[PDB]
């Protein structure tokens, strides 16, 4: 059994997150997938705007079949100490990660374009011709 770790904001969870979580879950035949959900204050300070609170973004992730455990809030920066505390074998994510590639603990997951929740609102608005 292999312990995988993925982290992220997971704001307005869409098929993109789900597919990336699925891919992480399936890196190995027998895995335990831990998902870390970044904090509101830190995501806003370092990355950008978040619609949903930590509590909302977390409650929604618990419905994704690929998720075995959630760390909420997770650290903004993943540390080697953090890997050992939770006995993580691999970190799955789409440099600040060089030390992970060096431990052989880096596993790249892919992003799907064009399926985000915001992409969906755009498709709603395209029913209203500009004139």
| Of the candidate residues 26, 44, 85, 123, the single one contacting its own copies (CB under 8 A) | 123
| Alpha carbons 76 and 60: distance in angstroms, whole number | 20
| Closest CB 124 distance from its own copies, rounded Å | 6
| 27 interacts with its own copies by CB under 8 A | no
| 59 interacts with its own copies by CB under 8 A | yes
| Closest CB 44 distance from its own copies, rounded Å | 12
DSSP 8-state code for residue 76: S
Query: Are 4 and 24 a contacting pair, CB within 8 Å?
Result: yes
DSSP 8-state code for residue 14: -
| Of the candidate residues 2, 3, 64, 71, the single one contacting its own copies (CB under 8 A) | 64
- Indicate the residue among 16 and 36 with the shorter CB distance to its own copies: 16
| Alpha carbons 54 and 6: distance in angstroms, whole number | 16
Among the listed residues 50, 24, 46, 44, the one whose alpha carbon sits nearest the alpha carbon of residue 35: 24
Query: Are 59 and 67 a contacting pair, CB within 8 Å?
Result: no
Which residues does the annotation place in the binding site? 9-10, 17, 47, 94, 112
Residues that bind its own copies (CB under 8 A): 12, 14-15, 18-19, 21-22, 49, 51-52, 56, 59-60, 63-67, 115, 117, 120-121, 123-124, 127
Which residues does the annotation place in the binding site for phosphocholine? 9, 47
């Amino acid at each position: 059994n292999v312990v995988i770790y993925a982290d992220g904001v997971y704001d307005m969870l869409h098929l993109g997150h789900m597919k990336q979580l699925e891919q992480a879950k399936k890196l190995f035949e027998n895995t335990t997938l831990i998902v870390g959900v970044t904090s509101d204050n830190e995501t806003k300070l370092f990355k950008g705007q978040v619609v949903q609170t930590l509590e909302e973004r977390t409650e929604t992730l618990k419905h994704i079949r690929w998720v075995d455990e959630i760390i909420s809030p997770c650290p903004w920066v993943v540390t080697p100490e953090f890997l050992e505390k939770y006995k993580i074998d691999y970190v799955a994510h789409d440099d600040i990660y060089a030390w992970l590639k060096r431990a052989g603990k880096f596993k790249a997951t892919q992003r799907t374009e064009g399926v985000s929740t915001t992409d969906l609102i755009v498709r709603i608005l395209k029913n209203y011709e500009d004139y």
